[PDB]
Amino acid sequence: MEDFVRQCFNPMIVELAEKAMKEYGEDPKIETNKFAAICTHLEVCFMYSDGGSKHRFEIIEGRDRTMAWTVVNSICNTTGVEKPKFLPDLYDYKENRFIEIGVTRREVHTYYLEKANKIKSEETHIHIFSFTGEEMATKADYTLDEESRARIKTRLFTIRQEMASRGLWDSFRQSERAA
Numbered sequence: 786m787e788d789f790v791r792q793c794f795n796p797m798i799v800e801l802a803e804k805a806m807k808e809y810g811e812d813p814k815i816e817t818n819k820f821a822a823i824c825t826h827l828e829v830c831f832m833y834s835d836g837g838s839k840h841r842f843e844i845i846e847g848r849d850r851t852m853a854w855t856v857v858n859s860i861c862n863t864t865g866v867e868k869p870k871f872l873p874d875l876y877d878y879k880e881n882r883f884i885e886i887g888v889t890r891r892e893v894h895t896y897y898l899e900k901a902n903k904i905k906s907e908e909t910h911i912h913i914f915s916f917t918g919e920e921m922a923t924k925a926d927y928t929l930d931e932e933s934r935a936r937i938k939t940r941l942f943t944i945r946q947e948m949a950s951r952g953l954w955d956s957f958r959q960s961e962r963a964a
């Protein structure tokens with residue numbers, strides 16, 4: 786699974802996933818499902834940020850925590866928008882809201898609800914993707930056009946097939962359940 790992650794995602798994503806795990810005391814070589822999952826989440830965040838007009842999104846995910854918070858604070862202080870309790874992934878300059886992006890191996894609505902009650906925000910938009918083509922967003926406002934979301938769904942499905950074809954998919958699907 787480790788080698789699969791390293792040849793499936795680009796070096797930059799891999800490097801950001803390694804950092805993120807080291808910060809939390811996890812080992813990429815041992816917890817290889819969480820490694821893959823983190824790479825996946827990062828990829829989706831970047832595709833998503835790319836999905837609109839070329840400067841629509843402040844990218845929050847992938848940065849160092851302290852700089853992420855600094856950027857978050859600048860947005861709040863300049864837009865008025867309320868300050869999130871947890872680090873979101875993106876800010877949408879067009880719609881004036883932060884976005885939390887989720888990717889689940891379980892049901893979209895389950896994840897959506899866990900994520901919603903964790904953040905406690907009538908402002909932060911939530912957008913969940915699955916490895917089965919499903920998506921759920923706050924007030925069914927999917928932010929992006931169809932094409933951009935579709936591209937993401939396809940990519941996710943390819944990752945699932947690529948894993949499946951190596952027999953790593955079951956272990957990966959179950960592991961989000963074990964957490």
Ligand SMILES: O=C(O)c1cccc(O)c1O
Pocket residue numbers: 826872874886887888
């Ligand atoms: O920001 C995170 O750390 C995070 C952790 C787990 C799942 C996520 O979607 C995240 O954005």
Ligand SMILES: [Mn+2]
Pocket residue numbers: 846872873874
């Ligand atoms: Mn995040």
Ligand SMILES: [Mn+2]
Pocket residue numbers: 826874885886887
């Ligand atoms: Mn997220």
